[PDB]
Design an enzyme around this catalytic site. Sequence first.
Site, PDB file in Angstrom:
ATOM      1  N   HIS A   1      34.103  45.154  38.531  1.00  7.66           N
ATOM      2  CA  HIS A   1      35.494  45.125  37.951  1.00  7.66           C
ATOM      3  C   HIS A   1      36.473  44.366  38.822  1.00  7.66           C
ATOM      4  CE1 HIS A   1      38.856  47.127  35.600  1.00  7.66           C
ATOM      5  NE2 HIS A   1      39.543  46.895  36.705  1.00  7.66           N
ATOM      6  N   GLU A   2      36.466  44.641  40.143  1.00  5.94           N
ATOM      7  CA  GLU A   2      37.556  44.114  41.003  1.00  5.94           C
ATOM      8  C   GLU A   2      37.423  42.563  41.049  1.00  5.94           C
ATOM      9  OE1 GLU A   2      40.098  45.805  41.669  1.00  5.94           O
ATOM     10  OE2 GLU A   2      38.933  47.551  41.159  1.00  5.94           O
TER      11      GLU A   2
ATOM     12  N   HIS B   1      38.823  40.623  38.396  1.00  5.63           N
ATOM     13  CA  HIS B   1      40.190  40.246  38.718  1.00  5.63           C
ATOM     14  C   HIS B   1      40.298  39.096  39.697  1.00  5.63           C
ATOM     15  CE1 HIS B   1      42.168  43.436  36.683  1.00  5.63           C
ATOM     16  NE2 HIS B   1      41.635  44.382  37.426  1.00  5.63           N
TER      17      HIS B   1
ATOM     18  N   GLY C   1      45.330  35.796  47.534  1.00  5.68           N
ATOM     19  CA  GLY C   1      44.834  35.446  46.183  1.00  5.68           C
ATOM     20  C   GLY C   1      43.309  35.610  46.186  1.00  5.68           C
TER      21      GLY C   1
ATOM     22  N   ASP D   1      45.942  55.729  48.053  1.00  2.59           N
ATOM     23  CA  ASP D   1      46.535  57.023  47.785  1.00  2.59           C
ATOM     24  C   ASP D   1      45.593  58.175  48.066  1.00  2.59           C
ATOM     25  OD1 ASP D   1      44.778  56.147  45.866  1.00  2.59           O
ATOM     26  OD2 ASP D   1      46.117  56.558  44.188  1.00  2.59           O
TER      27      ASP D   1
ATOM     28  N   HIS E   1      42.686  43.378  32.222  1.00  3.81           N
ATOM     29  CA  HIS E   1      42.002  44.502  31.590  1.00  3.81           C
ATOM     30  C   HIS E   1      41.593  44.250  30.147  1.00  3.81           C
ATOM     31  CE1 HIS E   1      43.784  47.127  35.005  1.00  3.81           C
ATOM     32  NE2 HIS E   1      42.574  46.691  35.323  1.00  3.81           N
TER      33      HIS E   1
END
Length: 156
Positions: A113-114, A117, A87, A70, A123
Amino acid sequence: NPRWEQTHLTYRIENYTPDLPRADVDHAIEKAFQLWSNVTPLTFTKVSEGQADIMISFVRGDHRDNSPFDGPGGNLAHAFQPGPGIGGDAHFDEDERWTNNFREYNLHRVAAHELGHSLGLSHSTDIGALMYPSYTFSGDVQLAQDDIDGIQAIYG
Ligand SMILES: [Ca+2]
Ligand SMILES: [Ca+2]
Ligand SMILES: [Ca+2]
Ligand SMILES: [Zn+2]
Ligand SMILES: [Zn+2]
């Protein structure tokens, strides 16, 4: 909530942001996998060719997955949960100005952080945790206890 079934994982950096010298990209990512492998039995091997478990890239707007980026700000990066194909992959919005200092946005810190995941974490509600939904940073990156607990509940 999917887990990786093998503890030895592969990753590749498909491309490099021009925001930072190559070597710094490499070390931000490296040190970020290290946060996770230090506290679990996971090990990570970087490869320069072919498909890896975790494919890392810098992309902008529509990049053929279903979460277009964005522009500067807003969403900074996203990662997919463990599994085959996309994945595990992590994507960094090239519309951000990536840093290696305390200034927004620190690559090593977002990667930490990523990759949470990428390994199956969701979170955290703890504001001191790398997994908090929202970017926080003052210049040091360490797992919080909450992060350690969540990655260990998955990998032992
Ligand atoms: Ca993958
Ligand atoms: Ca963005
Ligand atoms: Ca940029
Ligand atoms: Zn994406
Ligand atoms: Zn997140």
